[PDB]
């Protein structure tokens, strides 16, 4: 996260860390949407252009963390992936369309103050909130500038940008299953999701029910301070359920 700030403890309790077993390293961000499912990007588990294609056995997820490095005793929970589910029509070739995937955990995870699930959007929430100017919150352990490693989870707030403007700045084919947020270089308000925050949540707090909803997923991190592409969660809540229900 570029131009972010140390997150407060338990502030983003659904924040998940995608960890690689051998060799131990941090891959992507992710989120806990139930006691058994984790939502993340697709290019985090499969992207041929990089000879990348992880199996449910090469990874594990760490939940409840704050420190990027320190294993937090009696705080975090290490979980093994039971089954992965990349998106059917996920296209890595050009613009990462439907850059989303779910992951099941071999065992359920006990919630705590540092572990808790975020909410999936509904048509009205999605409609009330997904507006230009309206800000969402992004969080991660990615780099700070384009060492550049955060000591703890970083957090920054970004405004959504009109589908039009997003379309002009980038020469890539930006479908409706994705929105973009950041700051038109008019505001001198540096802020954005840098490489490593992918799979992470873009959440908004509803003024109607006080709950936090995950409107997007970091997908093409706007470089590291253009605009960042976030997968449109709601316009995909279908597949997200069509997959959980079946198992």
């Amino acid at each position: 996260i570029v131009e972010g700030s140390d997150a407060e403890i338990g502030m983003s309790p659904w924040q998940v860390m995608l960890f690689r077993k051998s060799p131990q390293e941090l891959l992507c961000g992710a989120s806990l949407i139930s006691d058994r499912w984790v939502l993340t990007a697709a290019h985090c588990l499969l992207y041929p252009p990089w000879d990348k294609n992880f199996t449910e056995n090469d990874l594990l997820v760490r939940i409840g963390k704050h420190s990027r490095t320190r294993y937090e005793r009696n705080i975090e929970k290490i979980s093994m992936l039971e089954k992965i589910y990349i998106h059917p029509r996920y296209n890595w070739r050009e613009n990462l369309d439907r850059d989303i995937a779910l992951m099941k955990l071999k065992k359920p995870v006990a919630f705590s103050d540092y572990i808790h699930p975020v909410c999936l959007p509904d048509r009205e929430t999605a409609a009330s909130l997904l507006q230009a100017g309206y800000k969402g919150r992004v969080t991660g352990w990615g780099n700070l500038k384009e060492k550049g490693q955060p000591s703890v989870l970083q957090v920054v707030n970004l405004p959504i940008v009109e589908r039009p403007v997003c379309k002009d700045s980038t020469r890539i084919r930006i479908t409706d299953n994705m929105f973009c947020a950041g700051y038109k270089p008019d505001e001198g308000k540096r802020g954005d999701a840098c490489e490593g925050d992918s799979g992470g949540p873009f959440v908004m707090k509803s003024p109607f029910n006080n709950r936090w909803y995950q409107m997007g997923i970091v997908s093409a991190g706007a470089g590291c301070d253009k605009y960042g592409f976030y997968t449109h969660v709601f316009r995909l809540k279908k597949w997200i359920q069509k997959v959980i229900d079946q198992f």
Binding site: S5, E8, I9, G10, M11, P13, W14, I33, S34, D35, S112, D113, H116, P117, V118, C119, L129, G133, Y134, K135, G136, R137, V155, N157, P159, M204, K205, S206, P207, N209, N210, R211, W212, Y213
Partner: protein
């Protein structure tokens, strides 16, 4: 699950986090 989006140390305690007002300020609009 059916209690999501509610943070144990924040909403469940009626406490605000350092930067959540900034979001509402952006939904309504400027101060």
């Amino acid at each position: 699950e059916a209690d999501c989006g509610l943070r144990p140390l924040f909403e469940k305690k009626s406490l605000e986090d350092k930067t959540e007002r900034e979001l509402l300020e952006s939904y309504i609009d400027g101060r």
